[model samples]
Target: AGELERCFLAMPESVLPIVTMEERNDLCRRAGHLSGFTHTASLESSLGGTVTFLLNRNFIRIQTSTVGEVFMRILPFSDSSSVICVVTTVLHPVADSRIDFYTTEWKPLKTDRFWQQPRIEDFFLPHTDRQSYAYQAIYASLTPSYMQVSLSEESDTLSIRQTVTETLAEEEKPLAAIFLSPEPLVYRWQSGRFVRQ
Candidate 1:
């Protein structure tokens, strides 16, 4: 009873395109109560803590605990020159990852930052180094840019394995090539977490 690094964020409404579907659904219930996620759209608050809203296209995800699983993108590179990338796909208190690059207002380009994309079954799947398998987003893409997460070991035959990918490169490169395609991003655990169906 002493471990909780859970955080999630995905406001959708087409990634807040200058906000307005009634202020993007009131900014997704005020960004799900400032990120602690409570009663988000009501399913009894989805069991644990967060489960605000999930989306696909131009990206939007955050599971900011245990420190990893945060991405916000708006990429459409090469001439159309669109950029805005931020990634994190860490695993546990160790095997970490990170990336950052911004613009289109958030400003911070000029070879931003990169070097985080690895989950080859966290090195040959099996026992996943003694348990703690939580790498969970399933799929997201908006023309070239990417996002996928699912590395599991919790169940009666639900032994999943689709290890990581938070791509957003075509203008600022260094690391953007990890897509262990097995297509797994279809969650559904009612009142205790795991949402994105």
Candidate 2:
């Protein structure tokens, strides 16, 4: 099996209790079928909710519950055998993500030198006036501000989207849109880390 497959098989059940290892293996095997490849798997989670998974090379996306999903990207280092695992967990309108370095055997590298998490303010337009009343009102609506981070499957890019605007009321949305950029903040993975682009 490839390094990505090995790393996935080694993932702890606690991290993804919705699906068993055997089920994961079955999904991976089916994904390799020549004529009828299927990349999705559905099963009842322990909590009786339906859980689904979309599997691909170096990537795993899981829909855990009605309002929760998880995305994982496995990135290999060119200079060494180690790999970096990016895990983004989304609970409805909020999302949080983390980067973890691990050995080929899935041993934690216990280092935080690779990625620096971006702030909510970073996703706003550069010309936004932070001191304006509209800006303050919009910002205040993000009581529990959180950004959604997604990894691109076809490229080495991380896209961060602000979620507060979606929760704003219809009238407030227009005002929020004035201060919030419609585009997601994009960061490219380069030089051993992700840099905003």
Candidate 3:
């Protein structure tokens, strides 16, 4: 249970250049199971989990929390910068929603995310907290080696994997996840989580 976040339209592929497979794998491995979500429900009251897969975008994002401590994970297809493929899965544990997209880059839209995107209702209309997940999506641009699990895809394309059961012991919160967005990444999420009627 946490605050709500929103998503925005995507930016061009990061011109900084796609990090090499080794670089992506190493970075993802270092990131080690990334997840960042807001707590609108006052982390003191809710305990639940979420698992969603974007069948068209080749990825899955899972989020869960009991009180304020949230654990979220997104498993994305390895080496998927060429085609937009969504990997479909049944989102479990909490909430009712469908569709998640695996992406390569993220950016803010006019100081706001998707909740404010005009004419977007005709297309991508995620929950109120999607914008907050831009960071999550970007983090998944390349599968992190350490996050390899049955929950994730294993293929030759994704050659490396993490053997560390525990994330790095860095002085910094190695686990303090983020919600990625490129320059101009901001938010004005008025709504909240996706609730089924």
Candidate 4:
């Protein structure tokens, strides 16, 4: 099996039963019959939700439920002979993400070595001052401060968006919007780490 497939099957079945090789083949066949194409496939999983193969052996996404999904990407490492795996779990409303790193063989690796979690301030406009009353009001409005992180299927960029304001009262949204960035912060894999772009 290829590295991505091996790494995917290494995931605990208890967590997601769709990891079996047989199931993968079945999904691929079903998708091929339906679309008359190769390289990409998707199917409604037996347990629930849908599993999508963005790239046959490079990327996969599983929507575990209405508000939850998981993405896995097989990325090149520093050396040609090795590869790294990135798995991101997303939970919605907040669209918050938790990312993990692993070897192609599914052995866990330290995430800090490959990526740095962005701070809340990073999501705001550059000139926004944290000490200002407006900023404080926005900050206070976030019952629990968090930002959303999502991976791009067509590229290596990781998009980060401020989601704390989603829970803000209608009247407070305008004030918060003034301090927040309209665009998501983007990061790309570079020199063995993800650099803000």
- Which candidate leads in lDDT? 2
lDDT of each: 0.36, 0.67, 0.24, 0.66
TM-score of each predicted structure versus truth: 0.25, 0.79, 0.18, 0.77
Q: Which tens-of-lDDT digit does each residue in 75-123 have in candidate 4?
A: 7676574455455555765667777776676577888988887777676
Model 4, CA-based lDDT: 0.66
Clashing pairs in 1: 5-65, 7-64, 47-191, 47-192, 138-185
User: Per-candidate RMSD vs. true structure?
Assistant: 17.8, 3.3, 21.2, 3.7
Regarding TM-score, does 2 or 3 come out ahead?
A: 2
Give the TM-score ranking, best first. Answer: 2, 4, 1, 3
Candidate 4 C-alpha error for residue 78, in Å: 2.3
Tens-digit lDDT track for model 1 on 1-197?
00011111333334333333454355445444332232223121212333233333334554533345655544434444455555556655333444555555555664423223333443233333322223222223212223344322222111222323433234311222232333543443223222344
Candidate 2: clashing pairs of residues? none
Taking the tens digit of each residue's C-alpha lDDT, what string does model 2 give over 18-62?
Answer: 667776666667666312222777777545688887766656677
Deviation of model 2 at 128, angstroms? 2.1
Model 3 steric clash total = 29
Model 3: CA > 4 A from native = 1-61, 66-80, 83-95, 107-197
